[PDB]
């Protein structure tokens, strides 16, 4: 049948900010993972609950492709059982995740001479995200006892901040494009199968 549109996810011209991470539902298609196997220059390509050697042999009810930009030092947070600013406040994988996480250095696309400030992350939140929770609110964060009433000041902060992607950045501060493939297996008919 027709191939899952991994092309539209991995090769998108524009990627989301991690706080406003993008989800594409994939279903009713053949997932030929050879487009990912034939790439040598991903910085990371790991699967959880399933061997990457089995992807072309398995069937799922749906696949979800989540995509966003973070910085180099944070790529390790896109894994089960991780904590930090991204896993806590921006994008949380469950501990029982079944799927794959791919990232690559995008410094040639996502940095610019005077700095690219287009990509944001959430710096502050009252509590940690649940797995696959998305928070796009811009409510002023109350860091103290005195309420803010939507006015910034002492202990009253805007919750989002720009990554500063300058081409002179160290690898830890360079931009990485991330795709997370979640493999959903419900008590329902499979609509995504590998070519076997």
């Amino acid at each position, epitope marked *: 049948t027709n191939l899952c549109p991994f092309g539209e996810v991995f090769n998108a011209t524009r990627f989301a900010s991690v706080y406003a991470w993008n989800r594409k539902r994939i279903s009713n298609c053949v997932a030929d993972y050879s487009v*990912l*196997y034939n790439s040598a220059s991903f*910085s*990371t*390509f*790991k699967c959880y609950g399933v*061997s990457p050697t089995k992807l072309n042999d398995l069937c799922f009810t749906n696949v979800y492709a989540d995509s966003f930009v973070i910085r180099g030092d944070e790529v390790r947070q896109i894994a089960p059982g991780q904590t930090g600013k991204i896993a806590d406040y921006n994008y949380k994988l469950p501990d029982d995740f079944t799927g794959c996480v791919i990232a690559w250095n995008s410094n040639n696309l996502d940095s610019k001479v005077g700095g690219n400030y287009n990509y944001l992350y959430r710096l502050f939140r009252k509590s940690n995200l649940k797995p696959f929770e998305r928070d796009i609110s811009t409510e002023i964060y109350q860091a103290g006892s005195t309420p803010c009433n939507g006015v910034e000041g002492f202990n009253c902060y805007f919750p989002l901040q720009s990554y500063g992607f300058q081409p002179t950045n160290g690898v830890g501060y360079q931009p990485y494009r991330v795709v997370v493939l979640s493999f959903e297996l419900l008590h329902a008919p499979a609509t995504v199968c590998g070519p076997k």
Partner: nanobody
Amino acid sequence: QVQLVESGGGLVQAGGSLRLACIASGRTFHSYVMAWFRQAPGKEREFVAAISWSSTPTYYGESVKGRFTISRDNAKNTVYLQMNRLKPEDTAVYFCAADRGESYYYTRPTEYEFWGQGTQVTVSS
């Protein structure tokens, strides 16, 4: 903050056998892909073997396929490397590594978060 401790290293005659062991701290061992790397005198770390959560698949470096066997005992938090028909070129420090994920790029050291300090193997002619 999982610790990995390698053992079974030592001096062995060429043609001989050696079994390495690596024990992980904690009760997470079942959730880890386990791997062996080695660093031969004045060389970079080289991939030796890896084993998936369920014991399949297993992976081997070109140099050791047919001679080495990787296995795991989840009840003992232990991964084993059975080394047969040892050559002087197998002289190296053998490092245990673990990760929650199974990498498509299973030979890359950067795909494994957790590392032991290594066990010395010397193969004498």
